[PDB]
């Protein structure tokens, strides 16, 4: 609802196409921070809603090291960037499980401690 | 120190390269472009014409913006024609 507020102002002025859009600030970014998730949505189900706008190559769900349950945020890289422009913009503020999730562009830095979780995820997304 | 700097640079590069979208990197332009699995049934229309991933459930999920961009897209494209045609004297 922070970002959703921008695009309405932006569009209203007829900004139209990325050169003048704030989405142009990125261009080298693909991963999207996916916030305010419900707790029971897992990687496969976050890999349901987000293929509407593109083809995901990677995904990471943030979850506590001990109990292994959702922190409530994920990082999902689309194959073709412009999906990011599309997902952030179009799907932000949308309800799943009662709570309206947040998306925004992100620069994502991998962490050693999950290293195996990368191949374990990749191998499934490497199937396609 | 120099070696350290070099290492840092390398890591930065790695970070950036990992982050970059795949189609741009091969790029040079603009059933998958990179052979990734693609959907089957007809999808909703889109600004960029991108096709949903094979794994899509098939429900509309949208705030409703993507359709409102077309309304503005059509508008702006229409008033370029209306401006001359409604001109009079």
């Amino acid at each position: 609802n922070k970002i959703q507020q921008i695009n309405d102002k932006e569009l209203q002025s007829g900004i139209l196409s990325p050169h003048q859009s704030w989405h142009n600030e990125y261009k080298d970014n693909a991963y999207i921070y996916i916030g305010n998730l419900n707790r029971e949505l897992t990687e496969g189900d976050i890999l349901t809603v987000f293929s509407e706008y593109g083809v995901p190559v990677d995904v990471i769900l943030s979850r506590d090291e001990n109990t292994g349950e959702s922190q409530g945020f994920a990082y999902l890289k689309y194959e073709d960037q412009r999906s990011t422009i599309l997902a952030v913009d179009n799907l932000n503020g949308f309800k799943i499980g009662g709570r309206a999730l947040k998306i925004d562009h992100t620069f994502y830095r991998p962490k050693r401690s999950l290293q195996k979780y990368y191949e374990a995820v990749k191998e499934e997304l490497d199937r396609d | 120190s120099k070696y350290e700097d070099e290492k840092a640079a390398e890591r930065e590069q790695y970070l950036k390269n990992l982050n970059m979208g795949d189609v741009q990197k091969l790029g040079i332009n603009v059933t998958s472009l990179l052979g990734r699995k693609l959907y089957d049934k007809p999808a909703p229309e889109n600004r960029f014409a991108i096709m949903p991933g094979s794994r899509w459930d098939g429900v509309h999920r949208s705030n409703g913006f993507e359709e409102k961009w077309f309304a503005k897209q059509n508008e702006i494209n229409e008033k370029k024609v209306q401006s001359y045609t409604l001109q009079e004297d």
Partner: peptide, 22 residues
Amino acid sequence: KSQYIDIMPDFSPSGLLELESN
């Protein structure tokens, strides 16, 4: 050698996504 990592992904449907449609 016991487990790769204690965490690991799922790739399993939750009842929430299917439920909302029906």
